[PDB]
Every structure is written in C-alpha cells, then in structure tokens.
C-alpha cells in the first residue's frame, strides 16, 4: 500500500499499537528511482509504504523521529 | 557479521552504503512483546545486524536510521 507521507505515519502508528501485545514491525528503507528513497513497513499482516523525496525529507524525519522514539520502549 | 558493540557497526554499515548506494538496504525490526530491537544493513554482498535493545541505544539507533535517509536524498 503506497500512501502519502502523512497517511504513512498514522498507519505506522497503528502497527506499533497492534503488535503492542505480540508481533514484530519491520521497516525497510532503501534507495529508489524507477533524488528519492523508499520506505516500507510490514507487521506481517498488512503492508504500507511511501516514497520520500528531497522535497519532504525535512518534514518527514521530524514527525518520523518522534513516532519512532515514542513507540519504541525496551530494556532498562 | 553481528557487530554487537557500537561505533564499529555504524562505520562499517556506512561504508557498505558508500560502496554501492543503489543495492544497499536497512531494515529496522521492533518486537515490543519481548522488548527488543534489531537493525540490519545488508548490501547484496555482505550482511551486518545489530541486536541488544538496551533503550539507551534507541536514540542512537534511529538517528543512524534517519541519517542514512538524508544520504539517499541529497
């Protein structure tokens, strides 16, 4: 599911809540043209993806780094 | 392969990227049930992974994740 850079963040929020009891959430980042970069996330059941260009990278990492640090809480 | 330390996995994975930027990929696996994290930077020629949740690594792990994102786009 290739989404917009905004819809991607709300669906990536639910993948961290859906597997909050059990499950893994993968995030595969890769170079892509056919500059831009490809980001994909899959808990195993539902796939989401987006393409992030130089036009919206600054806008992305900010909301993206906040979502990651918040929904990732492991060991002490 | 599994550089279960720091600043040695980062410098090797970054050199994997500068070697061939088109083929390299980085995955980020989170497992909240058991409470662990997993980074991997594979390059179609080699393979480097990093376990050890240790939440003091959560910040340095996603900055490494968000830093590679600016190199794909420059």
UniProtKB/Swiss-Prot annotation, chain A:
Compartment(s) where it occurs, according to its Swiss-Prot or TrEMBL record: Cytoplasm
Record carries keyword Transcription regulation: no
Superkingdom: Eukaryota
Swiss-Prot/TrEMBL GO biological process terms: protein targeting to ER; SRP-dependent cotranslational protein targeting to membrane
One GO cellular component term noted in the UniProt record for this chain: signal recognition particle, endoplasmic reticulum targeting
Function: Component of the signal recognition particle (SRP) complex, a ribonucleoprotein complex that mediates the cotranslational targeting of secretory and membrane proteins to the endoplasmic reticulum (ER). SRP9 together with SRP14 and the Alu portion of the SRP RNA, constitutes the elongation arrest domain of SRP. The complex of SRP9 and SRP14 is required for SRP RNA binding.
Name of this protein: Signal recognition particle 14 kDa protein
Gene coding for it: SRP14
From Swiss-Prot, chain B:
Subunit structure: Heterodimer with SRP14; binds RNA as heterodimer. Component of a signal recognition particle complex that consists of a 7SL RNA molecule of 300 nucleotides and six protein subunits: SRP72, SRP68, SRP54, SRP19, SRP14 and SRP9.
Organism of origin: Canis lupus familiaris
Function recorded in the entry: Component of the signal recognition particle (SRP) complex, a ribonucleoprotein complex that mediates the cotranslational targeting of secretory and membrane proteins to the endoplasmic reticulum (ER). SRP9 together with SRP14 and the Alu portion of the SRP RNA, constitutes the elongation arrest domain of SRP. The complex of SRP9 and SRP14 is required for SRP RNA binding.
Highest taxon above the source species: Eukaryota
SUPFAM superfamilies: Signal recognition particle alu RNA binding heterodimer, SRP9/14
Any single biological process term in GO: SRP-dependent cotranslational protein targeting to membrane
GO CC, one annotated term: signal recognition particle, endoplasmic reticulum targeting
Pfam families: SRP9-21
Molecular-function annotations in GO: 7S RNA binding
Compartments (UniProt record): Cytoplasm
Family recorded in the similarity comment: Belongs to the SRP9 family.
Protein's gene: SRP9
The protein's name: Signal recognition particle 9 kDa protein
Protein keywords: Cytoplasm, Ribonucleoprotein, RNA-binding, Signal recognition particle
Family annotation (InterPro entries): Signal_recog_particle_SRP9/14, SRP9, SRP9-like, SRP9_dom
């Amino acid at each position: 599911v290739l989404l917009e850079s905004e819809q991607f963040l709300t669906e990536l929020t639910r993948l961290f809540q859906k597997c909050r009891l059990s499950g893994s959430v993968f995030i595969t980042l890769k170079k892509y043209d056919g500059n831009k970069c490809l980001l994909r996330a899959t808990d195993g059941k539902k796939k989401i993806s987006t393409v992030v260009s130089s036009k919206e990278v600054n806008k992305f990492q900010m909301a993206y780094s906040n979502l990651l640090r918040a929904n990732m809480d492991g060991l002490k | 392969a599994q550089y279960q330390t720091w600043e040695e996995f980062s410098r090797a994975a970054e050199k994997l990227y500068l070697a061939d930027p088109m083929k390299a990929r980085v995955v980020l696996k989170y497992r909240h049930s058991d409470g662990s994290l997993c980074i991997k930077v594979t390059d179609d020629l080699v393979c480097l992974v990093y376990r050890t949740d240790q939440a003091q690594d959560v910040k340095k792990i996603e900055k490494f994740h968000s830093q590679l994102m600016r190199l794909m786009v420059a």
